[PDB]
Design a protein around this ligand. Structure first.
Ligand SMILES: Cc1cc2nc3c(=O)[nH]c(=O)nc-3n(C[C@H](O)[C@H](O)[C@H](O)COP(=O)(O)O)c2cc1C
Ligand code: SF4
Lengths: 432, 62, 129
C-alpha cells in the first residue's frame, strides 16, 4: 500500500529513457520511445485537464526551489487581456555540481520541445522561449535541430499536432552568467539587459518577459509534463513519499568512484544512491567526510547525517539543508573542507550581479573572511562574526543568490567549527 | 534579420545579446566600434550595449 | 472659577514700548514667517516640521584688520521657532514687526509602481537597472 522504502526504480518507469544518448536523439528515435504520442488528444483535453494532471502528480519545481508546479502553472490560467502570454524554459543550468539539464537538452530534446507545447497550452502561451546557457553551444544546436524537425512534422508552429493551437519555440542563448538562471534575471536577459533580478511583486504571471504574463519553468519540470499527461498524475504520484513525488535526475560528482548522472525515485536514501549508482565513496563509506546534497547553494551535511537521510525536499529540510537541484557533491576525508567551501564563496562572489547591497558587499566580505579562514589567519571570535554576517545577507537581498551564498557558510560553521578553530590554532603557533 | 524577428515588434532591444554574440563570432572579439555598430542596428543607446558587453563574461573586449 | 477679579481690555496686544528694542529695529525690519525648505542635498524631512521667523538681511563688511565679516545688525542671527503659522503671526504682531507669511509647501503624493518599470507598451519601461 503506502510503500515506506524508496529506490530501485525500474527502467520501464524511467522518463528520460535516452539519458545516456545511446539511442537516436532525433525525431524518429524519440517517436519510437513514445515522444509525441497522442499529443493532439492531450492538447484537446484543454488547459484545465492538463493542469489537473500536473496538480495530481504532485510535481514540484526541479530548478532548485521546489514550488508545487501545478499550482504555479495555474497562475496563468486566466482570461487574456491585450498582452500575449509566454512560457520561458530555464535551461541556464549554472549551479555548481548540476549537469542534469544538459543531458536532457542534447539527448532528449524532443521531450523538452513537446513539454513546451503541452505546458504552453496549459498556460495559454503563444510561444516558448528556451533560455540555454551560452557555453552549451553544441547542446543548443542539437535542440535547434530538434525544433526544426518538429516544425517540419507539423508538431509545433501553426496548428500544432493538428490541434488548431498555434505555438512557437524559440531558443535564446545566454552569454555567461550564473545569475541568469534566477527566474526574473532570466527574463531581463531575454529583454536585452543585464541579468539583474527584479523585485516581486509584480510576479511574472502578471508582468513578465516584455511585460507580459510569463511562467519560468525548469527544463526537467517541463520535460516530464507530457509523460505525466500520457501516463496520468496518479502514476507519477505513486513514487516517493507524499508531497515528494516522482522520479528525479541526480548528479553524483566529487570523490566517488563513478561520477554519473542517473534517474532514481524520489525519497531514495542518499547512501544507497551513492553506493548503487556512483560506485561508492572513494576509499569506502568510512572515507566519507561530508556531502553537499543539492548543489553549491545547499548546506553541506556530515557523514553522520548522510547515513540515514532520504533524498527529497522534506527529508533534507529536516537535516538543515535542502534538495536543491539534487546535485550530490561528495567529499572524502582527504578533502580540505574549508578550502572546498571557500571556493564556493569565491564562486558566488564572481556570480553576484552586484545589484543589491547585502550581496554585492556582503558576499565579497564573506569571501575575504573565508580566504583567511583557509590559512588560519584569523581568531575564533571571527567565526561568530562570520555567522552574523551571513544572517545579515540571508533574507535581505533581492534574489535568492544571496541566500545561496550564506547557506554554505552556515553549514560549514554548523558542522565543522572545530576544524576552523583547529586551523586558527595552527597558524598562531607557527607564526606567534 | 532572423534574430530580430524572434521578438515582439517594439522590443528590438531583446536582440542585443545574440547580435552582440554574432559580432564576436565574425570578428573574434568586440572592439568598441563593434559595440557601436550593434547599438546602431538595433537603435538602442550605446551605453545600454556597453552594459551588456561588460556584464556577461563570454564577450571578449580584448 | 476664579477668586481674582479680572478686568476687560479690548486693546490689541502691543508690547513694543516695554521690550527695550530700539525704534530702528521695530519699524524698519521685515520679519519672514516660513517653513524652511528641505535641504536638497539630503532626503531627510525632519527640518521641515516647524515654522520659523527670520529678519531681513543687512550689510556685512570686511574687517580692515583681519578681513572678518563685520555687522551692525543686532538681529542678524535671531531665528525663532513656532508650532503653527498662527503662533508666529501672533508673536510678530504684538512685537510690532511687519511680516510676510509664506505658505507651507507639502510635497504632493506620488503614484509609485515598480511594475511600471517593465511595461509592455508604455514609455515607463526602463532600459537599465
Ligand atoms: C542564482 C540562481 C540561479 C538559478 N539557476 C537556475 C537554473 O539554472 N535552472 C533553473 O531551472 N532554475 C534556476 N534557479 C531557480 C529559478 O529562479 C526558478 O525558481 C526556477 O526556474 C523555477 O522553475 P521550476 O519551478 O520548474 O523549478 C536559480 C535561482 C537562483 C537564485
Ligand atoms: S542577491 Fe546578489 S545576485 Fe541577487 S539581486 Fe542582489 S546583488 Fe544581484
Amino acid at each position: 500500500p503506502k510503500k515506506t522504502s524508496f529506490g530501485s526504480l525500474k527502467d520501464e518507469d524511467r522518463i528520460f529513457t535516452n539519458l545516456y544518448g545511446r539511442h537516436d536523439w532525433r525525431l524518429k528515435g524519440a517517436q519510437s520511445r513514445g515522444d509525441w504520442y497522442k499529443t493532439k488528444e492531450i492538447l484537446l483535453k484543454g488547459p484545465d485537464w492538463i493542469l489537473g494532471e500536473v496538480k495530481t502528480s504532485g510535481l514540484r519545481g526541479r530548478g532548485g526551489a521546489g514550488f508545487p508546479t501545478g499550482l504555479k502553472w495555474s497562475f496563468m490560467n486566466k482570461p487574456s487581456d491585450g498582452r500575449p502570454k509566454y512560457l520561458v524554459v530555464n535551461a541556464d543550468e549554472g549551479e555548481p555540481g548540476t549537469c542534469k539539464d544538459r543531458e536532457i537538452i542534447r539527448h532528449d530534446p524532443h521531450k523538452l520541445v513537446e513539454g513546451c507545447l503541452v505546458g504552453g497550452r496549459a498556460m495559454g502561451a503563444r510561444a516558448a522561449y528556451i533560455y540555454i546557457r551560452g557555453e552549451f553551444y553544441n547542446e543548443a544546436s542539437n535542440l535547434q535541430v530538434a525544433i526544426r524537425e518538429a516544425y517540419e512534422a507539423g508538431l509545433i508552429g501553426k496548428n500544432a499536432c493538428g490541434s488548431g493551437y498555434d505555438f512557437d519555440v524559440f531558443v535564446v542563448r545566454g552569454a555567461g552568467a550564473y545569475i541568469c538562471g534566477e527566474e526574473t534575471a532570466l527574463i531581463e536577459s531575454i529583454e536585452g539587459k543585464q541579468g539583474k533580478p527584479r523585485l516581486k511583486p509584480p510576479f511574472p504571471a502578471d508582468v513578465g518577459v516584455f511585460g507580459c504574463p510569463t511562467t519560468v519553468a525548469n527544463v526537467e519540470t517541463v520535460a516530464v509534463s507530457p509523460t505525466i499527461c500520457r501516463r496520468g498524475g496518479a502514476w507519477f504520484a505513486s513514487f516517493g513519499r507524499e508531497r515528494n513525488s516522482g522520479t528525479k535526475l541526480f548528479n553524483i560528482s566529487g570523490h566517488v568512484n563513478n561520477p554519473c548522472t542517473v534517474e532514481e525515485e524520489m525519497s531514495v536514501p542518499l547512501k544507497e544512491l551513492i553506493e548503487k549508482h556512483a560506485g561508492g565513496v572513494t576509499g569506502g563509506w568510512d572515507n566519507l567526510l561530508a556531502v553537499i546534497p543539492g548543489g553549491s547553494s545547499t548546506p553541506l551535511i556530515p557523514k553522520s547525517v548522510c547515513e540515514t537521510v532520504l533524498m527529497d525536499f522534506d527529508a533534507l529540510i529536516q537535516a538543515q539543508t535542502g534538495l536543491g537541484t539534487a546535485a550530490v557533491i561528495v567529499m572524502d576525508r582527504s578533502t580540505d573542507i574549508v578550502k572546498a567551501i571557500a571556493r564556493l564563496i569565491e564562486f558566488y562572489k564572481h556570480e553576484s550581479c552586484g545589484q543589491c547591497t547585502p550581496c554585492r558587499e556582503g558576499v565579497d566580505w564573506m569571501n575575504k573572511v573565508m580566504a583567511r579562514f583557509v590559512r588560519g589567519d584569523a581568531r575564533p571570535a571571527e567565526i561568530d562574526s562570520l555567522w552574523e554576517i551571513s544572517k545579515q545577507i540571508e533574507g535581505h537581498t533581492i534574489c535568492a543568490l544571496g541566500d545561496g551564498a550564506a547557506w554554505p557558510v552556515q553549514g560549514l560553521i554548523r558542522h565543522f567549527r572545530p576544524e576552523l578553530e583547529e586551523r586558527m590554532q595552527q597558524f598562531a603557533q607557527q607564526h606567534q | 534579420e532572423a534574430i530580430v524577428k524572434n521578438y515582439p515588434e517594439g522590443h528590438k532591444a531583446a536582440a542585443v545579446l545574440p547580435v552582440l554574440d554574432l559580432a564576436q563570432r565574425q570578428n573574434g572579439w568586440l572592439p568598441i566600434s563593434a559595440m557601436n555598430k550593434v547599438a546602431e542596428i538595433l537603435q538602442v543607446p550605446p551605453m545600454r550595449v556597453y552594459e551588456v558587453a561588460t556584464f556577461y563574461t563570454m564577450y571578449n573586449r580584448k | 472659577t476664579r477668586d481674582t477679579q479680572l478686568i476687560t481690555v479690548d486693546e490689541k496686544l502691543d508690547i513694543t514700548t516695554i521690550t527695550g528694542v530700539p525704534e530702528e529695529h521695530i519699524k524698519t525690519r521685515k520679519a519672514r514667517i516660513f517653513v524652511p525648505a528641505r535641504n536638497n542635498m539630503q532626503s531627510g524631512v525632519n527640518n521641515t516640521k516647524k515654522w520659523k521667523m527670520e529678519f531681513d538681511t543687512r550689510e556685512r563688511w570686511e574687517n580692515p584688520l583681519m578681513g572678518w565679516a563685520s555687522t551692525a545688525d543686532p538681529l542678524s542671527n535671531l531665528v525663532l521657532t513656532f508650532s503653527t503659522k498662527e503662533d508666529a503671526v501672533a508673536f510678530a504682531e504684538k512685537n510690532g514687526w511687519s511680516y510676510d507669511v509664506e505658505e507651507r509647501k507639502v510635497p504632493k503624493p506620488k503614484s509609485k509602481s515598480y511594475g511600471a518599470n517593465f511595461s509592455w507598451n508604455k514609455r515607463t519601461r526602463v532600459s537599465t537597472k
